[PDB]
Amino acid sequence: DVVMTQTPLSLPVSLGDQASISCRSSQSLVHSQGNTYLRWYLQKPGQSPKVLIYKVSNRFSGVPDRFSGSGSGTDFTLKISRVEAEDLGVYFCSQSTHVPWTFGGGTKLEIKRADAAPTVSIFPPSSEQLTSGGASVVCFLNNFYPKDINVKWKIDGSERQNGVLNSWTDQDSKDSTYSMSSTLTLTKDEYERHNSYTCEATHKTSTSPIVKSFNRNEC
Amino acid sequence: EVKLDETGGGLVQPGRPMKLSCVASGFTFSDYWMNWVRQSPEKGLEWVAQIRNKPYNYETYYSDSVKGRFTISRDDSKSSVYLQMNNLRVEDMGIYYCTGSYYGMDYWGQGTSVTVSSAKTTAPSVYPLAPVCGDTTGSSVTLGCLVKGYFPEPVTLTWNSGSLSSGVHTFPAVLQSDLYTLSSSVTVTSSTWPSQSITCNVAHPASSTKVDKKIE
Numbered sequence: 001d002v003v004m005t006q007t008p009l010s011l012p013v014s015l016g017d018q019a020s021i022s023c024r025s026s027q028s029l030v031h032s033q034g035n036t037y038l039r040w041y042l043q044k045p046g047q048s049p050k051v052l053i054y055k056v057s058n059r060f061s062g063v064p065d066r067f068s069g070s071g072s073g074t075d076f077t078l079k080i081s082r083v084e085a086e087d088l089g090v091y092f093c094s095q096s097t098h099v100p101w102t103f104g105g106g107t108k109l110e111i112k113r114a115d116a117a118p119t120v121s122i123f124p125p126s127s128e129q130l131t132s133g134g135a136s137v138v139c140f141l142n143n144f145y146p147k148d149i150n151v152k153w154k155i156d157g158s159e160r161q162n163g164v165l166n167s168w169t170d171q172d173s174k175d176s177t178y179s180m181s182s183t184l185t186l187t188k189d190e191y192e193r194h195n196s197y198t199c200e201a202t203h204k205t206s207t208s209p210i211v212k213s214f215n216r217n218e219c
Numbered sequence: 220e221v222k223l224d225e226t227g228g229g230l231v232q233p234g235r236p237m238k239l240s241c242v243a244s245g246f247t248f249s250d251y252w253m254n255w256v257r258q259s260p261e262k263g264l265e266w267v268a269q270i271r272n273k274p275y276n277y278e279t280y281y282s283d284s285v286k287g288r289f290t291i292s293r294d295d296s297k298s299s300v301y302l303q304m305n306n307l308r309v310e311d312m313g314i315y316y317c318t319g320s321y322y323g324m325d326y327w328g329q330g331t332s333v334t335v336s337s338a339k340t341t342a343p344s345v346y347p348l349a350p351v352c353g354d355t356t357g358s359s360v361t362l363g364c365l366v367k368g369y370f371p372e373p374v375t376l377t378w379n380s381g382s383l384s385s386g387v388h389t390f391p392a393v394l395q396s397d398l399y400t401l402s403s404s405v406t407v408t409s410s411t412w413p414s415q416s417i418t419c420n421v422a423h424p425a426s427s428t429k430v431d432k433k434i435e
């Protein structure tokens with residue numbers, strides 16, 4: 001397979017701005033005839049990934065003008081010369097010169113804002129949960145930017161548990177913010193075994209860890 | 220003017236099956252280069268199967284990922300190509316896309332979804348997550364609703380009570396061991412709205428039923 005990679009993995013810009021998304025490869029996708037086999041896919045949500053460009057230079061029907069394909073051999077670049085939001089999405093560079101044919105990680109177009117640090121919020125097991133022999137405490141980091149956070153959980157000051165269901169949501173409406181819910185699941189047994197539950201997360205805006213905590217005994 | 224149609228996917232249990240049906244109306248099926256590419260959800264696009272045409276002997280290659288297990292084949296006219304995953308090993312689970320080629324270009328499907336588990340059409344237990352040892356609470360109160368151990372995929376959260384414009388942020392469900400787990404929240408006002416109300420409203424068409432959980 002050809003290592004076909006992209007730079008950057010994400011892209012925060014603003015509607016009027018312009019992007020160069022980077023795709024580069026394993027060897028020069030320069031086939032014999034027809035030659036350079038490398039395509040550009042836009043993928044919008046719950047959608048099929050349409051292509052904008054083929055064999056580097058060729059723009060495909062309807063693909064808006066603001067779109068272009070530069071490249072030569074082992075090196076390529078597509079360019080929005082001004083991002084309307086319609087352009088919002090994952091951009092991939094595929095290659096059809098060297099079986100097995102390849103997609104790069106994609107590169108996600110993003111509105112570039114300020115807006116935020118997560119509002120962490122914690123929540124102890126529900127009575128019925130417990131009376132289910134089940135026990136999961138929950139943490140929500142609400143409305144953050146930039147996306148990268150890290151959540152962690154601490155039982156009795158020094159845990160690490162396995163039981164975490166991390167879920168994530170990008171926004172593409174108003175505030176351009178992203179949110180995160182994280183879930184520790186345990187037995188009713190381990191639950192009444194500890195008391196000191198903690199949710200500690202490190203962020204951009206951080207400096208120091210963002211933590212939320214509660215105590216079986218008290219909180 | 221062109222269509223690729225991935226006809227028929229779904230549920231299938233770790234193990235030994237599913238034959239997939241794509242259909243491409245609006246080009247010489249005949250003279251093209253057809254294939255199947257995937258990107259499980261929490262997966263990226265990867266490439267699976269390809270077959271060609273007359274001039275190429277209808278060559279067929281199939282990727283390592285599923286080489287000798289998976290298979291791609293084709294029938295001209297209201298031409299339908301087919302992948303044959305008699306052997307599904309769950310990581311094989313995403314949307315499988317059908318695609319044409321030609322000179323340099325190509326089009327893609329809408330794709331057919333494939334989920335694979337030994338789990339069984341279950342139902343979600345739904346819990347009410349009350350601002351409990353928190354501060355936003357007092358000023359701004361967020362309440363979450365946890366809905367878990369249901370299966371399959373299509374449950375519906377929905378909100379209520381209190382009475383205004385509030386910040387619901389409900390996350391993509393995720394697959395826990397062999398069933399889905401979901402959650403929702405509202406940053407809603409202090410006590411104004413606290414003192415009035417708010418009801419979490421959940422439901423699974425998918426079978427079982429729709430439950431209600433109520434903060435407090």
Ligand SMILES: O=C(O)c1ccccc1-c1c2ccc(=O)cc-2oc2cc(O)ccc12
Pocket residue numbers: 031033034037095096097251252320321322323324
């Ligand atoms: O580029 C072509 O000549 C061509 C024309 C019709 C059908 C397939 C191809 C085609 C190839 C033809 C011959 C060959 O040795 C390699 C080809 O690779 C392709 C790759 C594509 O992504 C898309 C198309 C091709």
